[PDB]
Design a protein around this ligand. Structure first.
Ligand code: SYM
Length: 257
């Protein structure tokens, strides 16, 4: 028979992946749009594959359980060969590299702070030393894991805060985190890429301070997948010819800065 379609896991996160609005019902792959959907399209034509997009069943990016070491999210879907690729804003980190493979990065970012304007707050240190303004991150994503494992004094203190208040400050999605910033005294620890999108849509919101780390998003594959190196080559081509730059400008398109 013919070559089977690759199963591609991904996750809803604007402007990387969203449900396309339309007047008539959309089915299958047609339901989705965004930067990572355009990226997937390019990879499919460059490499020559067909695909089926499936949103990660548990709704998570992926983190490790303390007791049994098991992963969840898109990372686990790859480990168990439930997906061939993860094409998503999936952060490349060493602990993830121990269990899945990544392409070279298609976008760079660092953690920063999303908050409201008109406060004196200027850095993570300003949050860490107090408990009136709450703060948190998306549960079972790389930002949460960054704080959970960091030995940096400020970040360790911030994790102590988040851990004891997990149910109230760790959030199910970035969208929910943004809602917390709009509806309570709350600052979200969010990746800088995503903050740039959010603050250009909502002129009430701003980034606080700079980037506290530096890393990239990559396409994930199960360990040993032959697709990983081929996808790296494709990403480099897309980068060199200006396509990734154009794609970012398209999806990131107020507000004064
Ligand atoms: C939402 C985001 C997910 C993050 N890009 C990851 O790959 O786990 C975060 O943790 O801030």
């Amino acid at each position: 028979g013919s070559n089977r379609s690759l199963i591609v896991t991904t996750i809803l996160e604007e402007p990387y992946v969203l449900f396309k609005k339309s007047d008539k019902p959309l089915y299958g792959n047609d339901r989705f749009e965004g930067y990572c959907i355009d990226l997937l399209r390019e990879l499919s034509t460059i490499l020559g594959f067909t695909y089926e997009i499936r949103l990660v069943e548990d709704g998570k990016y992926g983190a490790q359980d303390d007791v049994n070491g098991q992963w969840n999210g898109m990372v686990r879907e790859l480990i168990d060969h439930k997906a061939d690729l993860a094409v998503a804003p999936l952060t490349i980190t060493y602990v993830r590299e121990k269990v899945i493979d990544f392409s070279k990065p298609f976008m760079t970012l660092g953690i920063s702070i999303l908050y409201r304007k008109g406060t004196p707050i200027d850095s993570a240190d300003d949050l860490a030393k107090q408990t009136k303004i709450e703060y948190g991150a998306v549960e079972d994503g790389s930002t949460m894991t960054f704080f959970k494992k960091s030995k940096i004094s400020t970040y360790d203190k911030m994790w102590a805060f988040m851990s004891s208040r997990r149910q109230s400050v760790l959030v199910k999605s970035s969208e929910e985190g943004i809602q917390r910033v709009l509806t309570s005294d709350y600052a979200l620890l969010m990746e800088s890429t995503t903050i740039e999108f959010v603050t250009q849509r909502n002129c009430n919101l701003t980034q606080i301070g700079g980037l506290i780390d530096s890393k990239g998003y990559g396409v994930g594959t199960p360990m040993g997948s032959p697709y990983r190196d081929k996808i790296t080559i494709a990403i480099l081509q897309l980068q060199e010819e200006g396509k990734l730059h154009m794609m970012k400008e398209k999806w990131w398109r107020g507000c004064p800065e």
